[PDB]
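Researcher: We're teaching a course module on how sequence relates to structure. For the next exercise, students receive a sequence and then see the predicted structure as tokens, so they can try to spot secondary structure elements on their own. Here is the exercise chain.
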Amino acid sequence: GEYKMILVVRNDLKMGKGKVAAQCSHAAVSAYKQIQRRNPEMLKQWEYCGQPKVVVKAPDEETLIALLAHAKMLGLTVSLIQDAGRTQIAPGSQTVLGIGPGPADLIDKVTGHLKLY
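Model: And here is the predicted structure for the students to work with:
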């Protein structure tokens, strides 16, 4: 089946395009490391599909946590990235929630309604 990764960006932070790109990259690398360490097979299946990544929007932090819980309840991998205002991942505000890599059908149940970034 199809496998993918969704990157959810927090809209109320009003991050610029470059910052979003960086935060999404942090989430993708984090998720890759996680999935590699927990389900090598699903990782391979995601790579076979061309390791697709799609960026969507969430209005605020409350939404990110709700998505996190839902994804967890479906057995999906989750990656939460915090930024402090620099180039490094560090305690601060939650910027992006990475969901997956995981089965596309499950992922869509969690984020399918979110608007594309």
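Model: If you want an answer key for the exercise: The two ends are 25 Å apart (CA to CA). The CA atoms of residues 82 and 94 lie 4 Å apart.
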